[PDB]
Amino acid sequence: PKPYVAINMAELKNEPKTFEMFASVGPKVCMVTARHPGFVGFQNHIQIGILPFGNRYGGAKMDMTKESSTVRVLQYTFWKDWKDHDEMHRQNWSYLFRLCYSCASQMIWGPWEPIYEIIYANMPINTEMTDFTAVVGKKFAEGKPLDIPVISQPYGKRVVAFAEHSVIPGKEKQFEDAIVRTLEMLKKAPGFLGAMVLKEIGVSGIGSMQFGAKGFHQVLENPGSLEPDPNNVMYSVPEAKNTPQQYIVHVEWANTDALMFGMGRVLLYPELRQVHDEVLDTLVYGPYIRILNPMMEGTFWREYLNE
Amino acid sequence: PKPYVAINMAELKNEPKTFEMFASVGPKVCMVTARHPGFVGFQNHIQIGILPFGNRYGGAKMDMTKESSTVRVLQYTFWKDWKDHDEMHRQNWSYLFRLCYSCASQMIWGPWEPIYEIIYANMPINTEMTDFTAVVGKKFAEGKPLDIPVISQPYGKRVVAFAEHSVIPGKEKQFEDAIVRTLEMLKKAPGFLGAMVLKEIGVSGIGSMQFGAKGFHQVLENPGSLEPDPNNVMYSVPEAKNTPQQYIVHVEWANTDALMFGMGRVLLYPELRQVHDEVLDTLVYGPYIRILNPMMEGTFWREYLNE
Amino acid sequence: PKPYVAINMAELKNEPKTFEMFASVGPKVCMVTARHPGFVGFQNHIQIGILPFGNRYGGAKMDMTKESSTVRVLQYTFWKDWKDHDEMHRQNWSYLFRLCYSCASQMIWGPWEPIYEIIYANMPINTEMTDFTAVVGKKFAEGKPLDIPVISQPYGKRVVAFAEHSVIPGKEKQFEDAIVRTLEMLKKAPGFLGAMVLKEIGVSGIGSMQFGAKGFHQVLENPGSLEPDPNNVMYSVPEAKNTPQQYIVHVEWANTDALMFGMGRVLLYPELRQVHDEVLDTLVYGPYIRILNPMMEGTFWREYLNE
Amino acid sequence: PKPYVAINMAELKNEPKTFEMFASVGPKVCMVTARHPGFVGFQNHIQIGILPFGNRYGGAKMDMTKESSTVRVLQYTFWKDWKDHDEMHRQNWSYLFRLCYSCASQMIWGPWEPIYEIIYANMPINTEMTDFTAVVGKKFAEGKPLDIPVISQPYGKRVVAFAEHSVIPGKEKQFEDAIVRTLEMLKKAPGFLGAMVLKEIGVSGIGSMQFGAKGFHQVLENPGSLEPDPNNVMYSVPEAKNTPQQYIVHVEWANTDALMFGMGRVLLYPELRQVHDEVLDTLVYGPYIRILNPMMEGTFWREYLNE
C-alpha cells in the first residue's frame, strides 16, 4: 500500500566533519527508527545542485557540490500510518534526541520535518545491475513480463528531481488531476526511473525541534545528554499544514542528463507541454527543482509500496 | 553436492613483496592442491576492511588497504570429503611445505586452517557480464527461467561479507534454524549474490604447521628445502574443533554499499530484525564482519555445489 | 564454412611512430586485401604480454606494453580457399608491397606469414554491448534461444590467448582429439568467448618477403616504389609446412583475469586436467601463450564461419 | 594468595588520538574498577611486536610500533574471586560502559575479555632502581636474604613475553606438569623477572560487550550516554570457556634481548629443550609469542600475590 512520508530537512556546513558524522550517526538514527513496527523504510538524500531552467537560475547548476559552502539533506522515512512517525520519536526519544542533537555543531538551518501523503506513485523496486537476470527470469516464469521494471540502482547510483510546488487555494483538484496526467506521459522519457507526488499533511514539531518555551530552553541549554520534554510540543501535525497547499513532485532518473532533458520534456514536447501548462496555471510558487543524490536508503520501502 | 571447506588464514606484511609472492607462489599451491581428485575448487580472499557497525568499530572502515600495515588472507579450498584435504597435504607434502614455507619471510601470524561443513548454501555459479545472454538463452530453451541466476562476477569484481559467530553451547540448533530463516529473507536485498553458512568441524594441524616437538624444531630450523615429518601431527581434525561452536556466515554482494545496507537489512527492516534477533540471542562472540575481496578463484566449485 | 587463416607476424619498435603507421597504413592494406572475392575478413592483433604460468616465465606478465621495447603484431586474414591469399598478393602486388614495405623503418623481425586450416572452431559473431537486446529478440522470435551467443565485444574490448604448440610426429591425431575434448570442456569457464584450433599447412613466401636471390636483392635495394619480382618465390605454400606439426590454440576471453584463471582451468580442475594431460603428452614445444589485443578487425569473418 | 585474572583485549588505530585516550580515559576506568573490594590491582599492556622465532614469522619483529597501523592492548585486572570481576562491572555499569564506549572511534576489534585462573606463579613485587638498597637492608634485617628479589622495574621499564598455547583435549595435565618444569628451569636465564601460567576459565560477556539481541541493538544505537542492559548477557563466564583449553604463559624480562635469548633457552639448552619438548607435544596451537610493554599498572597486585 502507499506509505506516508516524513522528510527531515536540514542545512549543514559542507566540510568533511559533516560527512563523517553522517557516516556514524546516520546509521544509528536509522536503527532506532526501525524499532517501530510501522517503519517501512527510508531514503536519505543529499542535495547536489539546482536545476537552472536555462538561465532562470543562472547561478545554479545541477552539480554544485565542489563550490557549495553548505550541504542540504532531505531524509525520507516511510510509515504505514503517519501517526507512527511521532509515536516512534516519543517512544525512543532519549536515543533519538541525543543522536540528532549531535548534528548541532555542523548545523546552519533545521531540522524541519513536514509529513506527506502520497497521492500518486509510479515507483519500482530498486535493483543492482547484477540482479536483472534473476528478476527477468522470475517474471517470465510467473507469466508477468509486463511486471519487469526498469533498473533503478540503489545507493547513490541514480538521481532525483525534487520539484517544489505550492498551489492557489481552490485549485488543488486541478493541480492534482493535471500533474498525474503529466507524470503518466512523462514516464516515456528515456532513463525515467519512477515518480510520486507528495501532498503535505502537516509538520512534526518534535522532529523539527519546535517546542514551547520550556523545550526551547532545554534544547538551547543542553549539554547533549538531557532530553527536552517531548510533551512540550505545542501543536499537532495537521495544525502546521501550510496553506497555500504544498506538494513535492519526486521524479527519479538514470543520470543528470536524462533528468535535465527528461524533466524538460514538459517544455519541449508540444503534446506534453499543453498538459503541463494546466499544472503551471494553478501555482503560487514553483516549480523549483532540487537535484538530489539518494545515498543511504532502506530499499524495502518500495516492496511495501508495491505489495 | 555440498563440499567441505578448508580456510587457510594468515596475516602478512602489507607491502609489494608480499603481493609479488602471491602472484608466483599462489598459483603453484593451487596447482598442487588440484593433484587430488577430491579437490573441487578454491576461492582465495584478501581482507580489505572491517564493517564498522556505525561507530561500534569506529576505527575501522570497509576499505582499509591504503592505511593497513598488514594484509589478511583467507584461502578457501573445497573438498568432496573433508578427509581429502589432509590426504592431499600428505601426498604432496614436499611441494606444499616448500611452497607455503616460502611465505614465511612475509608472515606475521598463521597459517591457521580450520575445516568446515556447509550447513546451508544459496550460492550461484559465477558469470562474467559477457556470459548472461547465453545463460538466459539456455535456461529458456530448457524451460527453466527460474534457474537464471544473478550475475556474480569472478576475479575480484564483487565483495564478500565474512561474518564470524560463536554460539552458546546448547544453542547450536537454535542458531542454525534462525540464521537460515534470516538468510532466506536477506536474499531480497539489492545486489545480493549468495550466502552460505560454514560450521567448524575441526582444524588441520598439518595445514596450520602445528606439529609436535620434532616437527616444530624442523620448521624453526628449516633452510626452506627440508620438510618436517608430516607424521608428527599430534591431533586429528575433529580433536581441534572449538567449543563454543564457531560458524562463518559468508554473504556475497555486488559492491560495498550493497553489502553495507544489505547486511544492514537485518537491523533496518523490522520484519527481518525480529528474525535476526533470534540469531543474536545465541551468541558468545560476534557478529564480527570482515570485508573480503575474492581475487583468485576456481569458480568450478559452484558447479560442483549446484550439480 | 570454415575459412583458411593467414597470420602475418612481425616485430617492430614499440614507439609512437610505429602505432602511427598502424593507424594510417593498416587500413590501406586491409582495403587492398578486400579487393579479392575470396577474402572473408580479418582480425589484427598486438601482443600485449605473455602468460607467466606462475613463475615459469617469471620475467613475463600479461601486460608488458609499458616496459617492452618492441611490439609483436599478428594479423589474421581469412580466406574461402587458402590459394586465394597468394592470388590476392600477386593480383595487387604493386599496392601491397609498397604499403607493406613502408613498415620497414620500424621493423626488427618479419614478416613471417604461415597459413593454417581451422580444424575446430567454436567462435561466435562479435556484438557490442548495445546489440544484445536485438540479438535476443531475434533469436526468440526465430525459436532458437540456444543460439544466443555470449557478448564478444569487437575492437580491443576483449583479449586473446594465443597458445603455441608443436607436436611429436605421429601424435597429431592424439593431439587433435585431446585438444578438442579440452576446448569442449573449457567453454564452461566464466568469460569464455570462443576458441578455435589452427593447423599449419604451409608458409606464404610472398607474404614473408622470402624470394630467391633476384627478389632478395630487389627488396634490399628498394627505394620504396619498385616491387620485387612476385614470380621469384622459390617454394609453394605446402613446401614450407613444418614438421614437427605446428598448431595455434586461439581462445578468447572477456578480460585478462578470466583468461588467466580460465586457461588455468586445464590445470586447476582435476577432471579437465586429466583430459588436458593427454595434450601435454604429445608436445615437442609449448604450450607458450601470448596475450593478444584484437584491435582492428573485420568482424564479418565470423558471419562467414557461422553460416 | 593467587588472584584470578581478567584480560581485556582490543585492537585500535595506532595514532596519537588513541594514546591520548589511553592517558585520560584509562586512569578513569582503573579508578572505577577500584571501587570493588575484590580488586587487587592491574597491569595494562600494549603489544609492541611479535617474536619472529627466527624467520618463522619473518614479517614480524620484536618492536613493530613504528610501522604498525594498529595497537593491541591487553589489560589485566586481578581479583580475589573471579566472580568479583563481573560483579564490579554490573555494580558500576553506568560509569564503566560510558567510559569504555568512548574508545569507540578508535576501535577495530574487541573488546574481548577472557577470565583466567593462575595455576603457577613465580612473580616478584616491582621495585624501582632507587628501592633496592632498602629492600636488601630489610631482608637482611629479617634474616631472609633468599627473599631478596630481582629488580623488576614498573611502568614500562621491562618487557613481557605473552605466549599463547592451546592444548589437545586430554593432554591438559601433561601440559601443566611440563610447563611448570620448564619455567622452573627457565628462571636461570639472565634478566628473567618472573613467570606465571594462566588457564582460561571462561569469558566475561559483559566485559566483551556481548549481549543478547536487546543489548546488541542498544550498543549499536548508543549516542554515548546510555548503557545497554547489563542483565541481557546470555551466558555465564564458564559457559564460554574454550575447548581446546587455552593457556597464557606470561614471562617477564629485563629487556627484549634477554627475552629473545631467554625464551630461546628452551630451544638452545639441550637439557631444557628436552623438558620443553614435552610441552610442544601437547599443543593444538602455539606457542605464539607477543611482545608486550606493561605501561600503566597497579603494582600492589603482586603484594596480594606474595602475601
**CA C246/CA C114 separation, integer angstroms:** 10
Q: What experiment produced this structure? A: X-ray
**What is the total residue count of chain B?**
307
Using H for helix, E for strand and C for coil, what is the string for D66-97? CCCCEEEEEEEEEECCCHHHHHHHHHCHHHHH
Question: What residue numbers of C does the annotated binding site for Fe cation cover?
Answer: 85, 89, 113
Is the minimum CB–CB distance between B169 and chain D shorter than 8 Å? yes
- Contacts with A225 from chain D: Cβ below 8 Å: 223-225
Phi, psi of D64 (to 5 degrees): -105, 10
User: Going by C-beta distance under 8 Å and a sequence separation of 6 or more, which residues neighbour residue C192?
Assistant: B131, C150, C186, C251, C252, C253, C254, C258, C262
Is the minimum CB–CB distance between B263 and chain A shorter than 8 Å? no
Candidates A66, A36, A63, A39; CA nearest to A51 is: A63
**CA B165/CA D210 separation, integer angstroms:** 11
Do residues C183 and C161 touch, judged by C-beta distance below 8 A?
no
- Contacts with A98 from chain D: Cβ below 8 Å: 223-226
What are the DSSP E strand ranges found in D99-138? 107-112, 114-122
**CA B287/CA B267 separation, integer angstroms:** 12
Phi, psi of D160 (to 5 degrees): -120, 135
Contact A99 D225 (CB under 8 A): no
Alpha carbon separation from C151 to B140, C76, D266 (Å, rounded) = 18, 21, 64
Residue C239: Cβ-neighbour burial (10 angstroms; 0-12, 13-18, 19+)? exposed
Q: How far is CA B207 from the centre of its chain?
A: 15
Here the cell at position D140 is 637482611
Candidates A158, A156, A163, A199; CA nearest to A53 is: A163
Candidates A86, A88, A76; CA nearest to A33 is: A88
Candidates B255, B215, B260; CA nearest to B234 is: B215
Dihedral in degrees, nearest 10, Cα atoms D197, D203, D208, D209:
-170
Candidates A43, A34, A31, A54; CA nearest to A7 is: A43
**What is the total residue count of chain C?**
307
Determine the residue of chain A that is closest to D214 in CA distance: A35
Residue C241: Cβ-neighbour burial (10 angstroms; 0-12, 13-18, 19+)? middle
The dihedral built from the CA positions of residue B166, B169, B174 and B176, taken in this order, carries a sign that is: positive
Here the cell at position D142 is 629479617
**What is the total residue count of chain A?**
307
Q: SS3 for B298?
A: strand
Probe site for chain C from B133, B157, B297 (most C CB atoms < 10 A): B133
Q: What is the CA radius of gyration of chain C?
A: 20
Do residues A99 and A93 touch, judged by C-beta distance below 8 A?
no
Do residues A236 and A214 touch, judged by C-beta distance below 8 A?
no
Do residues C173 and C267 touch, judged by C-beta distance below 8 A?
no
**CA A108/CA A88 separation, integer angstroms:** 26
Q: Which of residues 241-260 of D touch B (CB under 8 A)?
A: 242-244
Is the minimum CB–CB distance between B42 and chain C shorter than 8 Å? yes
Give first-to-last CA distance, chain D, whole Å.
6
Do residues A195 and A250 touch, judged by C-beta distance below 8 A?
yes
**CA D158/CA D126 separation, integer angstroms:** 10
**CA A2/CA A81 separation, integer angstroms:** 10
Is the minimum CB–CB distance between B59 and chain D shorter than 8 Å? yes
Q: A89 among the known binding-site residues?
A: yes
Closest approach of B138 to chain A, Cα-based (Å):
12
**CA C75/CA D78 separation, integer angstroms:** 78
Closest approach of C116 to chain B, Cα-based (Å):
29
The dihedral built from the CA positions of residue B206, B210, B213 and B218, taken in this order, carries a sign that is: positive
Is the minimum CB–CB distance between D224 and chain A shorter than 8 Å? yes
- Contacts with B155 from chain C: Cβ below 8 Å: 255, 257-258, 261
Contact B152 A130 (CB under 8 A): yes
Task: Give alpha helix (H) positions in chain B.
Answer: 16-33, 83-91, 93-101, 132-141, 172-186, 213-220, 256-268, 270-280, 301-306
Candidates D280, D3, D277, D260; CA nearest to D165 is: D280
Beta-carbon-side half-sphere exposure of residue A259 (alpha carbons within 13 Å): 27
What does DSSP assign to residue B52? -
Burial C18-37 (b: 16+ CB within 10 A, else e): bbeebeeebeebbebbeebe
Q: Report the interhelical angle of A270-280 vs A172-186 (nearest 10°).
A: 160
Composition of chain C by helix, strand, coil, percent to 5: 35, 30, 35
**CA C55/CA C61 separation, integer angstroms:** 9
- Contacts with C258 from chain B: Cβ below 8 Å: 128, 154-155
Q: What is the CA radius of gyration of chain D?
A: 20
What are the DSSP E strand ranges found in A181-244? 192-203
Here the cell at position C80 is 574461402
B111 prior amide bond cis, ω within 30? yes
Probe site for chain B from D108, D229, D243, D290 (most B CB atoms < 10 A): D108
Q: SS3 for A197?
A: strand
Q: Report the interhelical angle of A16-33 vs D213-220 (nearest 10°).
A: 150
Burial D83-99 (b: 16+ CB within 10 A, else e): ebbbebbeebbebbbbb
**CA A34/CA A29 separation, integer angstroms:** 9
Determine the residue of chain A that is closest to D105 in CA distance: A24
Do residues C120 and C182 touch, judged by C-beta distance below 8 A?
no
User: Going by C-beta distance under 8 Å and a sequence separation of 6 or more, which residues neighbour residue A13?
Assistant: A69, A70, A71, A106, A108
**CA B124/CA A263 separation, integer angstroms:** 40
Contact A31 D220 (CB under 8 A): yes
Q: SS3 for C172?
A: helix
Residue matched to cell numbers 593454417: C116
Q: D85 among the known binding-site residues?
A: yes
User: Going by C-beta distance under 8 Å and a sequence separation of 6 or more, which residues neighbour residue D166?
Assistant: D242, D244, D245, D246, D247, D283, D284, D285, D286
Here the cell at position A70 is 553548505
Q: Which of residues 95-154 of C touch B (CB under 8 A)?
A: 132, 135-136, 139-140, 145-153
**CA C196/CA C53 separation, integer angstroms:** 21
Probe site for chain D from B229, B272, B281 (most D CB atoms < 10 A): B281
Do residues D204 and D82 touch, judged by C-beta distance below 8 A?
no
Determine the residue of chain B that is closest to D66 in CA distance: B69
**CA C118/CA D220 separation, integer angstroms:** 64
B114 prior amide bond cis, ω within 30? no
- Assign residue A265 a region: left if phi > 0, alpha if psi is -120 to 50, beta otherwise? alpha
Please report which helix (H) or strand (E) contains residue C26, including its range.
helix C16-33
Here the cell at position B218 is 624442523
Q: Report the interhelical angle of B16-33 vs B93-101 (nearest 10°).
A: 170
Do residues D122 and D195 touch, judged by C-beta distance below 8 A?
yes
Question: CA triplet B13, B19, B23: central angle to 5 degrees?
Answer: 145
Determine the residue of chain B that is closest to A153 in CA distance: B190
Residue B171 identity (one-letter amino acid): K
What are the DSSP E strand ranges found in C2-113? 4-13, 39-50, 70-79, 107-112
Candidates B108, B89, B43, B297; CA nearest to B207 is: B89
Q: Which of B128, B141, B300 sits opposite C191 (nearest CB)?
A: B128
User: Going by C-beta distance under 8 Å and a sequence separation of 6 or more, which residues neighbour residue C195?
Assistant: C120, C121, C122, C123, C183, C186, C187, C249, C250, C251, C252
Q: What is the CA radius of gyration of chain A?
A: 20
User: Going by C-beta distance under 8 Å and a sequence separation of 6 or more, which residues neighbour residue A193?
Assistant: A124, A150, A152, A158, A252, A253, A254
Do residues B107 and D59 touch, judged by C-beta distance below 8 A?
yes
Do residues B272 and B185 touch, judged by C-beta distance below 8 A?
yes
Residue B165 identity (one-letter amino acid): H
Burial B25-37 (b: 16+ CB within 10 A, else e): bbbbbbbbbbebe
Residue matched to cell numbers 517503519: A39
**CA B269/CA A36 separation, integer angstroms:** 10
Is the minimum CB–CB distance between D49 and chain B shorter than 8 Å? no
**CA B291/CA C165 separation, integer angstroms:** 42
What does DSSP assign to residue A264? T
**What is the total residue count of chain D?**
307
Do residues D28 and D99 touch, judged by C-beta distance below 8 A?
yes
Question: CA triplet C229, C230, C233: central angle to 5 degrees?
Answer: 100
Do residues C210 and C227 touch, judged by C-beta distance below 8 A?
no
Contact C257 B127 (CB under 8 A): no
Do residues D199 and D119 touch, judged by C-beta distance below 8 A?
yes
10 Å Cβ neighbour count for A268?
Answer: 10
User: Going by C-beta distance under 8 Å and a sequence separation of 6 or more, which residues neighbour residue C256?
Assistant: C62, C63, C159, C291
What are the DSSP E strand ranges found in B34-79? 39-50, 70-79
Contact A27 B255 (CB under 8 A): no
Here the cell at position D102 is 568512548
10 Å Cβ neighbour count for A104?
Answer: 12
Determine the residue of chain A that is closest to B257 in CA distance: A155
Is the minimum CB–CB distance between A23 and chain D shorter than 8 Å? no
Closest approach of D203 to chain A, Cα-based (Å):
28
What does DSSP assign to residue B2? P
Give first-to-last CA distance, chain A, whole Å.
7
Here the cell at position C25 is 597504413
